[PDB]
Amino acid sequence: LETFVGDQVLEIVPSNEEQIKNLLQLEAQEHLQLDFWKSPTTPGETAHVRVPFVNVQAVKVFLESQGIAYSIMIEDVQVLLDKENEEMLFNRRRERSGNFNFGAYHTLEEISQEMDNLVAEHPGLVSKVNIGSSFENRPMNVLKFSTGGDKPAIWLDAGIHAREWVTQATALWTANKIVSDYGKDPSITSILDALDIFLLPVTNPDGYVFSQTKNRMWRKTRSKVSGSLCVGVDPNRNWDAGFGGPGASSNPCSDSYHGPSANSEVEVKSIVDFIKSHGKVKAFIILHSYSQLLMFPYGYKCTKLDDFDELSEVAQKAAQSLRSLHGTKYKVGPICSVIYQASGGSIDWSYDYGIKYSFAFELRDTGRYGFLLPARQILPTAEETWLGLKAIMEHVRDHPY
Numbered sequence: 237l238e239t240f241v242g243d244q245v246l247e248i249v250p251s252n253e254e255q256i257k258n259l260l261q262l263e264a265q266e267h268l269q270l271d272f273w274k275s276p277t278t279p280g281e282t283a284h285v286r287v288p289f290v291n292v293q294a295v296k297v298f299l300e301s302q303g304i305a306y307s308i309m310i311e312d313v314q315v316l317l318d319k320e321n322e323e324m325l326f327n328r329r330r331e332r333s334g335n336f337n338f339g340a341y342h343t344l345e346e347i348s349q350e351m352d353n354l355v356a357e358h359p360g361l362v363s364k365v366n367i368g369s370s371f372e373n374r375p376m377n378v379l380k381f382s383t384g385g386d387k388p389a390i391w392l393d394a395g396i397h398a399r400e401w402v403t404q405a406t407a408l409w410t411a412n413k414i415v416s417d418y419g420k421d422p423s424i425t426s427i428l429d430a431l432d433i434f435l436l437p438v439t440n441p442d443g444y445v446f447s448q449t450k451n452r453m454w455r456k457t458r459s460k461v462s463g464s465l466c467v468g469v470d471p472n473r474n475w476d477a478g479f480g481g482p483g484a485s486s487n488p489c490s491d492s493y494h495g496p497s498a499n500s501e502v503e504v505k506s507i508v509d510f511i512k513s514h515g516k517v518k519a520f521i522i523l524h525s526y527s528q529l530l531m532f533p534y535g536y537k538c539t540k541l542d543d544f545d546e547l548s549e550v551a552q553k554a555a556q557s558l559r560s561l562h563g564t565k566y567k568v569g570p571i572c573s574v575i576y577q578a579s580g581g582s583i584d585w586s587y588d589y590g591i592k593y594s595f596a597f598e599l600r601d602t603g604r605y606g607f608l609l610p611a612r613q614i615l616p617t618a619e620e621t622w623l624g625l626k627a628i629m630e631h632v633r634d635h636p637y
């Protein structure tokens with residue numbers, strides 16, 4: 237168990253090119269052990285960084301010495317982690333007699349158990365598909381929602397980055413929501429009558445197990461590198477889309493390490509192979525946290541893609557639908573514009589492969605809790621996200637290609 241007693245999350249706002257260059261260096265300095273929750277991008281944009289207790293003063297002094305403005309966003313990370321653990325075990329005890337509570341975080345085993353129950357209770361609509369195994373030999377199980385036939389499909393995944401807990405939780409709630417509304421809501425009914433939906437709730441099972449058992453801040457896979465005492469690759473920088481280019485690190489010990497080669501991670505290779513074998517995937521949506529962003533390609537290059545106008549229109553519609561429920565605001569745009577240049581991303585590969593409707597969601601919140609989003613926000617997050625997902629799915633249904 238890794239503790240974060242005293243760790244602080246600072247919000248920094250570089251105002252010029254030099255301050256950014258300074259922050260990028262810090263981020264690149266693996267030995268300082270800083271954890272950038274939100275990397276520096278362009279002047280005027282905030283960056284969030286978790287600084288280990290021992291280095292808090294030294295980092296603050298350096299910041300001030302460079303005249304870099306900052307503020308304490310989270311006073312003590314351990315405070316949040318303790319509440320998370322407490323609420324999690326409380327729920328676990330209540331589930332011993334009660335029903336599965338979707339408004340709570342669960343273990344990988346509990347998630348799998350629930351996926352089997354879902355298939356068991358609705359055999360004519362839901363089935364489990366195994367697409368491979370993770371590095372540590374865990375099955376990559378996908379839920380296939382279908383009414384039958386050889387239909388085109390919509391791909392939806394969550395949890396590629398281990399610590400983004402609200403994503404796996406949101407994906408499981410979504411699976412229950414589809415089966416609950418099918419045959420009731422005319423929209424979800426028509427979408428399913430026209431397409432199959434493949435949902436992968438835990439895209440990085442090894443990293444997830446590790447974040448719950450050893451380090452809550454882990455984000456990468458758990459693969460073993462030949463010739464490095466460092467572990468893992470950033471699964472969202474491992475795809476064949478401008479692989480190895482700017483916006484990724486070649487340092488095995490970096491949390492942004494791209495891996496030895498494109499598709500080197502079995503978790504990623506499994507997805508790529510499933511998609512190539514299927515041959516009729518029409519939409520590819522990936523869930524992450526946090527920042528409240530709805531993006532489309534590209535991330536590896538910053539030029540507008542062919543379908544810019546349509547994708548922009550679709551994402552805007554989805555963002556407005558999601559906003560209606562609780563007033564949550566999302567930034568919309570191509571990856572490079574919204575965040576910055578990042579290579580080897582999944583939606584860039586899917587789009588280049590020919591899947592036009594490729595989108596990535598960065599869920600709640602904007603920094604107050606970050607990855608440690610309180611369980612009470614899981615339901616509000618899943619409900620409003622469903623509105624955005626449905627809007628995209630309706631468009632795919634209505635626009636065959």
Ligand SMILES: [Zn+2]
Nearest residue numbers: 397400524525
């Ligand atoms: Zn992520």
